[PDB]
A = this chain, B = another copy of it.
Amino acid sequence: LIVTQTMKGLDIQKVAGTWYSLAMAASDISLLDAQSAPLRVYVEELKPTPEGDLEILLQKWENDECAQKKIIAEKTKIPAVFKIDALNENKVLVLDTDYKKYLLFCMENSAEPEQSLVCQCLVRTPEVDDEALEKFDKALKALPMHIRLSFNPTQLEEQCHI
């Protein structure tokens, strides 16, 4: 309830497929700090289940290797909001998407939200889309972000972005 942008009319079937985490931003430097930072995750594929949920395939640097994790984001009453399971009451929110190029989303804890806010700009191809990054910065100016990372084409094609 910090993000004032949510997408009207989200057809989660159309956001299916391959995605690249072009940019990331968090309210805390320690969330995206190093490669092993807790919320430094790279999205691989989004798979909506027929029930209406969302299977997320991502890569995260855990041990000293690029691990592949599979998270499930269950639907709620609001079509643009999903819930992930743990002691952390995390909510994923889709802010904007044209389905064919980009998708902007934020993640936050429902109790300690502001120290959990982490947002990303996902794009379909391994290219630097300026239009998408502009929109991402636009949605970010109203939020308390303290770190912003951006990756280049070469890094987008590597496991865990090198």
Contacts and interface: CB of A to CB of B under 8 A. Distances in A.
Secondary structure call for the A interface: loop
Interface residues of A, number: 11
A147 B150 contact: yes
A135 to B, nearest CB: 14
Contacts of A55: none
Contacts of A145: 150
A127 to B, nearest CB: 15
Contact of A149 (B29, B150, B151): B29
Contact of A148 (B34, B147, B152): B147
A8 interface: no
Interface in A120-147: 145-147
Contacts of A149: 29, 146-147
A23 to B, nearest CB: 9
Interface of A: 29, 33-34, 145-152
Given A145-B150, A147-B149, A147-B150, 7 more contacts: A29-B149, A33-B34, A146-B150, A146-B151, A146-B152, A147-B147, A148-B148
